[model samples]
Target: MEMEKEFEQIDKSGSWAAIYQDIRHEASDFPSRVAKLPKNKNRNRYRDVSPFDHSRIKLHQEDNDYINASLIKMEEAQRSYILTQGPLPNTVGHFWEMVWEQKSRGVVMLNRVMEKGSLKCAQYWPQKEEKEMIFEDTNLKLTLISEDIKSYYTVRQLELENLTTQETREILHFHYTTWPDFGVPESPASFLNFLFKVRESGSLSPEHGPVVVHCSAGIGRSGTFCLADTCLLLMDKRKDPSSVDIKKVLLEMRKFRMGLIQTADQLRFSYLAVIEGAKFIM
Candidate 1:
């Protein structure tokens, strides 16, 4: 495997350092990049990791960067929409208050019981004629999950007023356990298991499509998953470590895709996810 091959080829520390100083540092958004910092200064202090000179680092200058960053994220959504054939095509739409209401754009809900695609989708209609699903939404696709978390609406909903109770069972189950845990695969066992079931379903597979992942404000959880998936894939091309330059690529992504994760913790975890050993080399 390219991962095992690259795992054996590089100096473990070099990779880790690149992950920490370069990747994680960028992820943290040093010198005016992202918003939000941990209140616990000691949490960021890794061994002898020196504290940044905040007095010298102007805060107002960084604020402007945030404004510039917002436009960047919007651009990403624009591109993805054009390329991906708009939001969640083949899904259902619903009506709300006489107007077509889109429930969470392309957000998929998680529910058991096999559903026939859109039938399980929110606002889905069957055996009758109604306003067809619309794909007018740009960037985000509305998806609603069941209150019990059993079912969810598909990204296809354009109108909610027409949906029956059965159609509401559709749910989007975005798999989250594919990424490696920080330094310990077992640290997040339950979370991973939850994702495993979602992946096994084989209905709405994320491996084949672009998935939006976010934690709280979107960066922390979202960034880590993207990095892990990117790094492992890059590592697969044993000949090209540069293939996994997530920080640079993500910067461009976050530039256009709002709520993208670039936190430092994500970087550190990306490094720790790799397996360190000579046996990996073939």
Candidate 2:
């Protein structure tokens, strides 16, 4: 009833902005000393968007352990997620190293390599026919085995090989391509479908490491994705779907990162997606 009441409150009134502002106010700001250091600043795509010092992912295999990535968890839902930026050309090796070190089964990408004639991400993975992508710096090689294209997303089956140890592992790359730059999807239907698809794939299972999720900056869209999914998972656990506070869930996530849900529209869209998602669990 409270959830529906809040929904009605936002539906009849435009209070998403106020709600979002209040969430940000409560989250305040966490120290990002590593991201702010002169040595680590260039690793961040945007000056303003950096992972909090407490949650920043320190690369296990690299000498310089900073990357624009954070590990966030919803303990009640048993969901763990790594929200990161789209890989930079220089940071691609570090990205894969994190993936391998973390032992993640999947990587969920929410942006395209090229957007609006600009490069939002590096061509970090091997192409369909290319031999393979070898990261000399990381001593790892990625071979793209197959690519499956759905309506608004693509799934790539990749083989990650450790050149040093010659060990191999299967990694799923789930790419959602239809999301607008800095905006939510045109429909939560497709977005929720993709989220469930990933969930059903067993990649998000608690037995595995966190699923790596990234957009251009990793704060706005990444935040939205993690927030919505985590809330729905919590809803399923609570039995009463309406009990989960969407704003409180987001505020908790923001403590692990910064500037999630950029605009009122993104926040509004997150609310819409979670409402749509709660329908099933309820």
Candidate 3:
């Protein structure tokens, strides 16, 4: 009942869209260096996708190149995530460079290659039976060791090898296959299960580098995933599920990434998932 009351309060204040607009207005001054990129030199496939200047990730080799990726750190939860736009053909090499430089153990992909008659993201990984993809630009080779296909998701064990050092590291790919381009999952149970699966593998552990998460634009579904996971962790830590204010937490998260949880529907689903996940820790 108390949870319902809180939900009602949130709804009664204004529609989710209005609240989202307010948040955007408050963040109007948020710095973004993406626009500074030369129009012809921009690597983002979509003109509208760009990363915030303050939190954007930089490649040591290509300091001037701006890729749509950001590092989001939730120090309270001891969790760090690299949220990035779907890799474009040219930026694919840089994406691997990030994973290599950051030493990330896992990649969580929330969008598919094609959706609703549009190309949502490139095929950044090898096929199920395929063994490897050699990225000449970054001198990195990705090899697929195994794959586990589930009803709603797929897990792939991959090896990322650096040609220069002749060193290799294992990377896990957790792909949520069923989520729509800009929508939430049908139920939080399945989504939470996927989240836990990644957790159980120790990919999200602090000992490892930040987990890389992306969607078509790396904002909507990517933000939802991080927000829901962080909120639930806070609830568990506090031992009081309702103690964490979802809106406030989201605002703090937005500080690291320009636009997260794109739609009102996505925001509402995030709260629902957080509430559902609270049951487990209780």
The estimated TM-scores of all candidates read 0.36, 0.95, 0.92
Tens-place lDDT digits, model 2, residues 34-119: 88889876687889888888888998744688989999877788889999999887899999999999999999998889888899
**Backbone Cα, N, C clashes tallied per candidate:** 37, 0, 0
lDDT for each residue of candidate 3 in 19-66, tens digit (9 for 90 to 100): 677776775346665645675254775566567788888776745556
**Per-residue lDDT over 1-282 for candidate 1, one digit per residue giving the tens place of the 0 to 100 score:** 244445444445446455445533444332422223433222221222222232111112222211111111213122121000011112221111111121222322222122333221133222122423323421122233232222222223222322323243232434232333233233433333343343344422333322323222234454444444444444555575544454565655443333344344444444445333111322
lDDT of each: 0.31, 0.86, 0.82
User: Which candidate do you rate higher for lDDT, 1 or 2?
Assistant: 2
Q: Which 10 residues in a row give candidate 3 its minimum summed lDDT?
A: 33-42
Instruction: Give the true-structure RMSD of model 2.
Output: 1.5
Q: Model 2, stretches more than 4 Å misplaced?
A: none
Ranking by lDDT: 2, 3, 1
In TM-score terms, candidate 3 sits at 0.92
- Model 2, poorest ten-residue lDDT window? 178-187
Residue 132 CA displacement from its true place in model 3, Å: 1.6
Candidate 1, superposed: residue stretches over 4 Å from native: 1-169, 175-210, 234-243, 246-249, 257-263, 274-282
